[PDB]
């Protein structure tokens, strides 16, 4: 199951999310930092 799942997940790289799509990808650490900033900001974190 793991081999099949990894193969499908790499056949379609969109599932990794914008940080790790591979094009213009800021990176997992940059995504975490931006998510910290978003969670601290009320406007983005909440619908408001």
């Amino acid at each position: 199951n793991a081999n099949v799942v990894v193969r499908l997940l790499i056949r379609r790289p969109e599932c990794f999310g914008p940080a790790l799509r591979g094009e213009g990808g800021n990176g997992l650490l940059a995504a975490m930092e931006e998510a910290i900033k978003i969670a601290e900001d009320p406007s983005r974190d909440g619908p408001s």
Binding site: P13, L20, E23
Partner: protein, 394 residues
């Protein structure tokens, strides 16, 4: 009968490009010495700029089933879809591979694709997949078929990236279609006969001079001229001419009487051409065009015109033969015949005459592969070291 690509055939992997809303075919190229990184070469403007297929031709040495390759890694056949193939670069002698050392073309996941000297490992091996459902797994691949290639090592597609202003080949998760055109088939080649892409010497009918540019007195204007010279130039590199046809597909086919082609000097890298002054001169690849650089071999000196022959897809018939087929070079557009200007190390200038003298017979000698490779290596080294010298001077 549709030809089916089998092993030991020479092919070029080409793909389409959509820069600024136009379709432009590009072939995969890589030069052995120096950078192993591959690059694309434009074959869509053969009318405008000659395409260098000598660094684009790959040969299908070995192809095996996936499980057979796995067993072999743990320890003249046809192709079927899903097979694991091995590609050897003809000029370099090295194999295509996934470099696994990305240049980071803004694609962090992608890997570079280049040439590897050793066949060991699954990096060199490639598995072919059908482009669409019309081709199914296990079907034998037609010559006109498209292909999808996946690296055995990284499970990445041979991909064309538009991210940079310059198009790049790379191993990427995105899939890109590739089409292979049969350059030549080795088994059907007729021995001792002139073939497309051959590196040859134009030995003059007097057997004591050959067509060559002047020696390397470091003068580019001196090199640009053409003359007949005898002696050691017959065994030197300045007398090597590469015979390039006007066809991208089936380039490695038997040459035809009355067939347009381009004669390129190997060492200088410049194409033989005829000026508006009826002057034999070498011009650059950029400004080399079909009209100026077209030349052909004619069976008889007499001016009978065979009109236009119909192009044939295949290895062809063997008619021009090495060492005995007396040829008279005739410019296709002007219709003139090549002959010695007779300014009389004879150093007889070559002029492009309207009717030609009686001694216009030219014989062809097939240069050895070692010598041709050495000549191209010399050209590449010259270019690199001139760039380096100019940079240091700057």
């Amino acid at each position: 009968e549709i030809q089916f690509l089998r092993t030991d055939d020479e092919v070029v992997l080409q793909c389409t490009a959509t820069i600024h809303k136009e379709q432009q075919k590009l072939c995969l190229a890589a030069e052995g010495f120096g950078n192993r990184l591959c690059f694309l070469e434009s074959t869509s403007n053969s009318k405008n700029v000659p395409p260098d297929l000598s660094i684009c031709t790959f040969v299908l040495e070995q192809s095996l089933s996936v499980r057979a390759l796995q067993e072999m890694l743990a320890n003249h056949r046809t192709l079927l879809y899903g097979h694991a193939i091995l590609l050897r670069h003809s000029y370099s002698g090295m194999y295509l591979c996934c470099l696994s050392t990305s240049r980071s073309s803004t694609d962090k996941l992608a890997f570079d694709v280049g040439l590897q000297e050793d066949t060991t490992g699954e990096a060199c091996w490639w598995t072919i997949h059908p482009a669409s459902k019309q081709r199914s797994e296990g079907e034998k691949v037609r010559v006109g078929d498209d292909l999808i290639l996946v690296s055995v090592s990284s499970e990445r597609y041979l991909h064309l990236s538009y991210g940079n202003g310059s198009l790049h080949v790379d191993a990427a998760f995105q899939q890109t279609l590739w089409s292979v055109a049969p350059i030549s088939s080795g088994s059907e080649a007729a021995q001792g006969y002139l073939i497309g892409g051959d590196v040859l010497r134009l030995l003059h009918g007097h057997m004591d001079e050959c067509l060559t540019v002047p020696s390397g007195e470091h003068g580019e204007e001196q090199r640009r001229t053409v003359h007949y010279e005898g002696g050691a130039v017959s065994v030197h590199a300045r007398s090597l001419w590469r015979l390039e046809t006007l066809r991208v597909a089936w380039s490695g086919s038997h040459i035809r009487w009355g067939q347009p082609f381009r004669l390129r000097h190997v060492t200088t890298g410049k194409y033989l051409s005829l000026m508006e002054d009826k002057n034999l001169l070498l011009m650059d690849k950029e400004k080399a065009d079909v009209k100026s650089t077209a030349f052909t071999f004619r069976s008889s000196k007499e001016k009978l015109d065979v009109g236009v022959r119909k192009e044939v897809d295949g290895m062809g018939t063997s008619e021009i033969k090495y060492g005995d087929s007396v040829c008279y070079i005739q410019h296709v557009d002007t219709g003139l015949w090549l002959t010695y200007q007779s300014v009389d190390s004879i150093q007889r200038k070559a002029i492009m005459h309207h009717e030609g003298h009686m001694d216009d017979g030219i014989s062809l000698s097939r240069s050895q592969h070692e010598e041709s490779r050495t000549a191209r290596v010399i050209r590449s080294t010259v270019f690199l070291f001139n760039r380096f010298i100019r940079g240091l001077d700057a």
